Design a protein around this ligand. Sequence first.
Ligand SMILES: C=C1OC(=O)C(C(=O)[C@H](C)C[C@H](C)C(=O)/C=C\CCCCC)=C1OC
Ligand SMILES: C=C1OC(=O)C(C(=O)[C@H](C)C[C@H](C)C(=O)/C=C\CCCCC)=C1OC
Lengths: 132, 136
Amino acid sequence: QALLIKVPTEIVVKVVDDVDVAAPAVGQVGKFDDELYDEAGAQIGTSSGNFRIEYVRPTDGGLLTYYQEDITLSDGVIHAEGWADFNDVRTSKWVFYPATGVSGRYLGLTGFRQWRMTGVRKSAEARILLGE
Amino acid sequence: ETRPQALLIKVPTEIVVKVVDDVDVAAPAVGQVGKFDDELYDEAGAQIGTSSGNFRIEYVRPTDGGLLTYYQEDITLSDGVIHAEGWADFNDVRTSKWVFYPATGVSGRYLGLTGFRQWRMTGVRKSAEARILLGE
Ligand SMILES: C=C1OC(=O)C(C(=O)[C@H](C)C[C@H](C)C(=O)/C=C\CCCCC)=C1OC
Ligand SMILES: C=C1OC(=O)C(C(=O)[C@H](C)C[C@H](C)C(=O)/C=C\CCCCC)=C1OC
């Protein structure tokens, strides 16, 4: 009924970007490819995605970025896309956005992709929380 | 099950029992607000809780003209309280699409759980469908 996939290690195996991490700006973009590891560190899949910093939120100066990604797990695909504050990304805080099970065991399931950067341009901790 | 890792609460009928608002649903604008009181029902038509909440339309997103709206509510289920708050696009609210924002268990069964509150309007100023999805 409800499923939690905890991913303590997510590795960024390639990223192409013109993001200035110390000073991000609207218009900056990234395309990335990740590998995902379970709680005892075997491979559970890959993600491929991109993002774009889109606007400055006037309430807090947030640098609102749109992410879109396909997470190919070993027992089904999951699509995730939505908004994140890049000021949270770069200060190692958690972000999240909707995820939709696209096939396999994940057919029918919807919920949320969560992650926090543990290593600039290199690693993240992630969760995938799903229900039916 | 003891100490589930993940937990889904399905709310197929959420009735808005009381709403006070100055929102023009046909042409919404920044500064408009509502306060709402809801009753939550399971698949069997039993009442599982209530919600007390408010919202404010805060800003216009330059991307798409989205009307970004900040929600906040206290959801009292019969077995504990969940707080939830965050951003939703009022264009989605009014065209009956799903919206969501973070949720945090505050007491009872939900203490120490976090996840998301999600809902879709099924009738403006009348009713919605909803899900609370939590993890530990
Ligand atoms: C899922 C990721 O969301 C990210 O933002 C990110 C990145 O690494 C960017 C592609 C590079 C950019 C310069 C950056 O933000 C760097 C640090 C974040 C590290 C990982 C965060 C998940 C992602 O993975 C590639
Ligand atoms: C879960 C709800 O979150 C809402 O925003 C809402 C409402 O009904 C508003 C309080 C009134 C506003 C004028 C409106 O848009 C009315 C309907 C929205 C969708 C229908 C119910 C979700 C909620 O329930 C009270």
